[PDB]
Amino acid sequence: ITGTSTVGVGRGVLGDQKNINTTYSTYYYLQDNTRGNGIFTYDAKYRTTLPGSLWADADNQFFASYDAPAVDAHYYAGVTYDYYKNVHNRLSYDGNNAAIRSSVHYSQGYNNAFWNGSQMVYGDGDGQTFIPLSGGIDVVAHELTHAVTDYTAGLIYQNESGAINEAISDIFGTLVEFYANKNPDWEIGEDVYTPGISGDSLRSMSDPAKYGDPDHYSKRYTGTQDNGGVHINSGIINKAAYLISQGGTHYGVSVVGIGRDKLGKIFYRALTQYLTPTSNFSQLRAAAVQSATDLYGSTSQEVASVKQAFDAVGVK
């Protein structure tokens, strides 16, 4: 809509206060005109039709429980936009400052969130497995990163390419979490998963085996469920990414960590310059090695560390 750019204040799903960019026209709308071609957040009103209604509030204060998912979908969309723009010079998910649209209160007791090809969609969870999923910045950024992948490498969502696809989304979801300095960690979904159980998450990048996911190519899942294990085999790449950033010894292989910013640079370059729809794990290693070579030089520590990390997870 058309109106004056304002700054509201609210609380997100976890009760944390934060300012949000709104637009004033009779009501204050969840429309942020400060980023790209706008970040727009919608109320789906427990329906499954999308996007629903552009979110309107009478007083620019968003402290009601019903507001909380909309605050976080809106705010974390902005933060994800800021990360890709400031860190990688990427303008929104399509590189052209496309509008980022998000619908919250999708359906009822819906334990999921997803990029659907044109927008973000967030369930509220059933209160046991999940609380409203926009409360997790890594979930927001994980899903928006699928759009980035779709517009760049086009990785096919099955088998090894699909595991790389998921890992990319876990890597940049986590790097957005760190960049936002929002209680960062190498877990995925910890802020919205199982409110009754503390200290857990959907999966761990630093120790995939904590939740029974492979951390080495020899333990890769070869079944047909989960589209060939895309959410399972991603642990192999996630652990490699963790090792590149933080270092460590894994199955006897010592990795010299090079930090998160370099991890992000190397994998963003691999994603956008080298990966293709059918890239497998070995081709990802080569794309990461070449990316580190482009950025830091063939004799660099960064290149050596990438090779050590893929060695550690058994990917040649």
Q: Which residues are catalytic?
A: 143, 231
Give yes or no for a contact between 156 and 277, defined as CB atoms under 8 angstroms apart: yes
Shortest gap between Cβ of 302 and Cl ion (angstroms)?
A: 18
Compute the CA torsion angle 288, 164, 271, 115 (nearest 10 deg).
-160
Site string for Cl ion, 35-74 (x = CB under 5 A): ----------------------------------------
160 is in an annotated binding site: no
CA-wise closest residue to 64 among 43, 34, 48, 39: 43
Chain contacts with Zn ion (rule: CB under 5 A): 166, 169, 183, 185, 248, 250
Q: Closer to Ca ion at the Cβ: 63 or 251?
A: 63
Question: Is 57 labelled as part of a ligand binding site?
Answer: yes
Q: Does position 187 bind Ca ion by CB under 5 A?
A: yes
Residue 302 within binding range of Ca ion, rule CB under 5 A? no
φ/ψ of 105, rounded to 5, equals 55, 40
The two tokens of residue 235 are 């642990």
Q: Is 194 annotated as a binding residue?
A: yes
| Axis crossing angle, helix 281-296 with helix 260-269, rounded to the nearest 10 | 110
Residue 254: in which H helix or E strand, if any? strand 253-255
Tell me: is residue 43 an annotated ligand-binding position: no
Nearer of residues 96 and 249 to Cl ion, judged by Cβ: 249
Q: How far apart are CA 143 and CA 148, in angstroms?
A: 9
Other CB atoms within 10 A of residue 311 CB: 19
61 binds Ca ion, rule: CB under 5 A? yes
Residue 188 Cβ vs Zn ion, minimum distance, rounded to whole Å: 9
Locate tokens 């727009």: which residue?
Answer: 40
| Binding-site residues from annotation | 57, 59, 61, 138, 142, 146, 166, 177, 183, 185, 187, 190, 193-194, 197, 200
| Binding-site residues from annotation for Zn(2+) | 142, 146, 166
Task: Report the interface residues with Ca ion, using CB under 5 A.
Answer: 57, 59, 61, 138, 177, 185, 187, 193-194, 197, 200
